[PDB]
Symmetry: C2
């Protein structure tokens, strides 16, 4: 099982000091810190086996190509996709959603159709669908929230109809920490012939994820939140849908033939969706990140994190005038407001105490609006965070209270 202290000693940024104080990094929901195994796997790859990966003859290139197709496989196993060919390497969740929206969206959603998202979505699971609806004349319908941060599921009967082509929904909210009941919802959507895109940017680091049990048609996530590098993410599409999708970006490596007088032909899935040099260094790093989480055990992480969350919720009970947002069973993040202070001031005092939290709309304006607040403060409690970091948060909020109140 889990030793938080052994885990923290893998993360070099956690030794840092900030504003002369010891960093309490509580913003892993925005981007996670990377263990040195991740950092060094990327660096070693650049120091020793670097080459172009376009299935080259020469050795380094042939080896780099295989290391990359191994990360594809490993990622596919990590989410239990049926095969490696169902995963497309993207820049991150956001790019993965725009690829679906354009490639699948353009040939499957028509004027008069509708698409459903929820009021808790992140802007990455909003904007691309908004753009698709404008382009084709479809309607974007929304599942409303309940006060407690959970979706009003009683509204589906009225949102799902025979024009519903897609449900795009978050696994886990980045502000509320709510986990949506994806499997039952996917069951429902599928009964109307609607596909489901699952945004799992805040799910893959907290517990095991199984796309076959989910039965989601599309699943997306980013590496930088899952202790990996930036610039790399994964888009999973069911083989049967991926095989009919037309290309989105065009260029090198995604074509089979290119003619200036007979036109161009495409290569097969997944490679049809990856144009030009891939972020090979980010792919190697992402494989390291996946091996590092799998070796900790998602179920040991989940367990440590859950207990940390319970500890935090319980101590925050003694911060006066604290508003929490979201369900009690929240995963990963704690979204809150302190009395009437603007979150911006609350996060500047916390920052000034060496405590990193995220403050603002969190790329979720419609969720702020639902709560009728312009912004919120948010703490992430990841696998490398401690009781002591929690205590500093509580104390800092109490002091912010005393001083500004």
């Amino acid at each position: 099982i889990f030793s938080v202290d052994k885990v923290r000693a893998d993360f070099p940024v956690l030794s840092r000091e900030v504003n002369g104080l010891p960093l309490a990094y509580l913003d892993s929901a925005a981007s996670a810190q990377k263990p040195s195994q991740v950092i060094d796997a990327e660096a070693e790859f650049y120091r020793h086996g670097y080459a172009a990966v376009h299935r080259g003859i020469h050795t380094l290139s042939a080896q780099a190509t295989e290391k990359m197709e191994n990360v594809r496989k490993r990622a596919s196993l990590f989410i239990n996709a049926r095969s490696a060919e169902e995963l497309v390497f993207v820049r991150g969740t956001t790019e993965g959603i725009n690829l679906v929206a354009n490639s699948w969206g353009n040939s499957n959603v028509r004027a008069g159709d509708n698409i459903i998202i929820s009021q808790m979505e992140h802007h990455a699971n909003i904007v691309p669908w908004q753009m698709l609806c404008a382009r084709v004349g479809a309607e974007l319908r929304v599942i409303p929230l309940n006060p407690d941060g959970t979706l009003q599921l009683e509204t589906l009967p009225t949102l799902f109809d025979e024009k519903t082509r897609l449900l795009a929904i978050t696994h886990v909210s980045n502000v509320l920490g709510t986990e949506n009941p994806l499997a039952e919802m996917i069951t429902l959507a599928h009964q109307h012939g609607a596909k489901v895109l699952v945004d799992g940017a805040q799910a893959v680091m907290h517990h095991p994820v199984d796309v076959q049990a989910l039965d989601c048609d599309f699943y997306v996530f980013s590496g930088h939140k899952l202790y990996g590098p930036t610039g790399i993410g994964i888009l999973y599409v069911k083989e049967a849908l991926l095989q009919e999708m037309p290309p989105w970006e065009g260029g090198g490596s995604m074509i089979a033939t290119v003619s200036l007088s007979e036109g161009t032909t495409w290569t097969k899935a997944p490679w049809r969706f990856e144009a030009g040099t891939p972020n090979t260094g980010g792919i190697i790093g992402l494989g390291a990140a996946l091996e590092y989480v799998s070796a900790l055990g998602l179920n040991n992480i989940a367990e440590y994190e859950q207990n940390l969350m319970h500890y935090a919720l319980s101590q925050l009970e003694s911060v006066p005038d604290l508003t929490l947002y979201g369900p009690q069973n929240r995963l990963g993040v704690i979204a809150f407001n302190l009395g009437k202070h603007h979150a911006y001031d609350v996060g500047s005092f916390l920052d000034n105490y060496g405590i990193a939290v995220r403050t603002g709309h969190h790329c979720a304006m419609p969720l702020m609006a639902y709560y009728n607040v312009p912004a919120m403060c948010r703490a992430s409690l990841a696998m490398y965070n401690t009781h002591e970091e929690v205590d500093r948060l509580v104390t800092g909020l109490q002091r912010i209270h005393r001083l500004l109140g």
Copy 2:
């Protein structure tokens, strides 16, 4: 000035051995090796200042945001853009071309219009325009080649007309090493009201590049060819055009406001075109790469490389039955065929001698077709390559000749 030996000692992969032999990496045109200053700038950033960059309050995040906006500025200075706000961070040249093609292309090229590319383009400067022409009903016209690997400029009068909305052309060919006369061509295009997109993936590492003197409207290049990481590239657009372009990817950070009942508004250029977490690690690395080239001096590099090229061309003169393709003044790469052996066999023998060259169509099928060959072999002679690596190439080709002939 330039010490090739001092330069090589910065590149860790050049000490490697391959197939038990000392690597002679002659494939920098496909992707370049990275100096340890580049590798370590990325790694240090992850070990010590890592955070989300979405203009966060907390310290690390505020610092990461500034490091990134400094790389934007530095890149803008490296190509002499008038300002930092004319550069968009992309995955690489390919993504930069698809962004222009969609964002600018969709609102500016209509049914009946035409777009001009050349017969030497790379697939990245082909495919996106092919897709745009299919979507809107425009015609893709091509500047033909001369035998020597130079464009037939006498054909422009017949290709440019009042329906020509764009010229997309390479700076430097990745197979022939030809440098197109961009400034005069841009002058011409502009006289018809056509914009010009310059593909400079093979220009930025060989000599200084100045987008104001060029007067190109769009310029693209990738970091992995310019001694930098993967997953990061630059798209330069003239401020006046960039300011009217609508967004391409949607999501976090590129919006000003997001409403589920009043619609969404956009932020300003460049940030309107960057959705979701950026490849922050690749950006830091790209800044290191830019500082490392600028400190060598593009003009010292150009000079060393040119002399290396002259040395190579002269020794290859004693390889029997060698076909070279491209002009004598070629930059960077040497494209060739050995007698009647398929390039694939030539590159496997070379590989087996520890010599990495690229063999195939090089993501330029129309250029192979022009030469009526399915493929070619290609050597890159970059700033870290030596006379001795050239000699091994020549010797290996002579032996391949003797054995297979």
